[PDB]
Amino acid sequence: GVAEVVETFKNPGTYSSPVINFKIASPPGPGTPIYGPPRDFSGYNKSYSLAIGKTSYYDPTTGTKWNDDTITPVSDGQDIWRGWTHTGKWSFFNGKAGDKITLSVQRDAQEASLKGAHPGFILFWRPEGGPLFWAGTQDLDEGQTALPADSDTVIGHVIVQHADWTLQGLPPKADHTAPAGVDTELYPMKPDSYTMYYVDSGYDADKYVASKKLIMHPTAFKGLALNDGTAGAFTKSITLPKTGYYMLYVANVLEVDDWSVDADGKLTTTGEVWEVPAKGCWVNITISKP
Numbered sequence: 001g002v003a004e005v006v007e008t009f010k011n012p013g014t015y016s017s018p019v020i021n022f023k024i025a026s027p028p029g030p031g032t033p034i035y036g037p038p039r040d041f042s043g044y045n046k047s048y049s050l051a052i053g054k055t056s057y058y059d060p061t062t063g064t065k066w067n068d069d070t071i072t073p074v075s076d077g078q079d080i081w082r083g084w085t086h087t088g089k090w091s092f093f094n095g096k097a098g099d100k101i102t103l104s105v106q107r108d109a110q111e112a113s114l115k116g117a118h119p120g121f122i123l124f125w126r127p128e129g130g131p132l133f134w135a136g137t138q139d140l141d142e143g144q145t146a147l148p149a150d151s152d153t154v155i156g157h158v159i160v161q162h163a164d165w166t167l168q169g170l171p172p173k174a175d176h177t178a179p180a181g182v183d184t185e186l187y188p189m190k191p192d193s194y195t196m197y198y199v200d201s202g203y204d205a206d207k208y209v210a211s212k213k214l215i216m217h218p219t220a221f222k223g224l225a226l227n228d229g230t231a232g233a234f235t236k237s238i239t240l241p242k243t244g245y246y247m248l249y250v251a252n253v254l255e256v257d258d259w260s261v262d263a264d265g266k267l268t269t270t271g272e273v274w275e276v277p278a279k280g281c282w283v284n285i286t287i288s289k290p
């Protein structure tokens, strides 16, 4: 299509345009955070290791569903659970229109024999051309004039996986700009809105156990499933549609015997495939050229 999901800015709130960090690598949970080098894939043939939350890619616990009306029949694009913005992990790169690259995500070597990972990704293009500072947003409302080091804004705390993502009602901004090469007719630069444009997405759909199921929409993401016969890993060729700055989100799909929600709307499961010691599994993200 793709769908566009339009959010209304509220601070405090779920759609408060919070800041994400390109270095944080540790899983969710208590304890000393682990920061690695910033995950800049510019130039390609780069690889970084990090942990992703158990159900970070698709989790009814987010308490919000979106709908994809570009799907026929329309009932098949309904009630899509979101992912968690901050228990997935973010990276970026600068690239050129036409760049043919390969994204790979697989279990980290330290966890290569531990079942749990089914990595997925979302790739966005940010026409603004670099990190987007927006005063008055959740983490930029104390007089900051710039983003903190190695950080960038994204729309909200729960994320859509197959849509253009738009935030409107932002604190008015007189310097929301894009570089000269950007068609601001097609990609507007509004004083009160910004859009993260969908480029691609996908997830490892190869199950560890044939009898089990993935915590995943029955039909909405049929075009997104990647099967290569290897559970815990995917590879996807991508040709960049635009010159500029890209934002990459990676998160996990959980495999279970069954899942539901409880009275509070929290995920319940039985027979999870989760052999790793923490609340997130370590994966290695690689972008190669070609």
Ligand SMILES: [Ca+2]
Pocket: 204, 205, 206, 226, 227, 228, 229, 230, 231, 232, 233, 234
């Ligand atoms: Ca696979």
